[PDB]
């Protein structure tokens, strides 16, 4: 559960990400597949060769989903109900992968925003993603 301070930090951080959401979304997965090879097994149908057009088209989806979550921080379950339908009941994704993606995402945001990625924000986004992760792993319908 987030503080008002946690929610301010998150909202500000994504206000600095801006249009580069798709760029970091795509970079996050690129990093995930390379850093942790096991996460490729959920994507046997994907093109995973360095600089894939599919990964870049898909990375934009993830970042478009996280940007909705920011708009509705007081209702993460209601906003992300359809994504729990997929990641939890359908794909049945192991929650440990969610830690790996969030880590790969947090690294991405750190490299591009070293001026805005302060320890105070670091904690807040870590909590934020672990709350999105909890929603997508839980069967609540």
């Amino acid at each position: 559960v987030l503080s008002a301070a946690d929610k301010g930090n998150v909202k500000a951080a994504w206000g600095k990400v801006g249009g580069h959401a798709a760029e970091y979304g795509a970079e996050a997965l690129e990093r995930m597949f390379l850093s942790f090879p096991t996460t490729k097994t959920y994507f046997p149908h994907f093109d995973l060769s360095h600089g894939s057009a599919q990964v870049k088209g898909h990375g934009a989806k993830v970042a478009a989903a996280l940007t909705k979550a920011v708009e509705h921080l007081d209702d993460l379950p209601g906003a992300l109900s359809e994504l729990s339908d997929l990641h939890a009941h359908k794909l049945r994704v192991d929650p440990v992968n969610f830690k790996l993606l969030s880590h790969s995402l947090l690294v991405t945001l750190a490299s591009h925003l070293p001026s805005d990625f302060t320890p105070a924000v670091h904690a807040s986004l870590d909590k934020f993603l672990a709350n999105v992760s909890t929603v997508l792993t839980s069967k609540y319908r």
Binding site: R31, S35, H103, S111, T118
Partner: protein, 145 residues
Amino acid sequence: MLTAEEKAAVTAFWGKVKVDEVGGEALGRLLVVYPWTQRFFESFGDLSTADAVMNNPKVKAHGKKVLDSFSNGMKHLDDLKGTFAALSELHCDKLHVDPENFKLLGNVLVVVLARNFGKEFTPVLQADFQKVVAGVANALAHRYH
């Protein structure tokens, strides 16, 4: 652990790393992002806010001591278990640190390294380091498993 090609770029990059600046930041964030870690450093002083944790002098001085032993493990890459047998025993038999927390510090290190180097720290170069930290963490959790 790493192959011969994966040893070269991991060491060449490591030489560019400032062991004081990064050390005091990685441990700093460990106590901010993961607040329950503050319990191990009660003697260390004021760790109330994100400002205090980052500017605590004992924090920063102890931060380098970690990265120096990390820098020590960069040489003895094949015998990490042997190099960390002293520090693996100390952290559980005396300090009762949970082996899961080790994984977090190797994680925080990468994030700080990416923050300090930006594009110089690439997806491929990160992948080699993710194994390094996952080897050092496992070497420090050796007394358990």
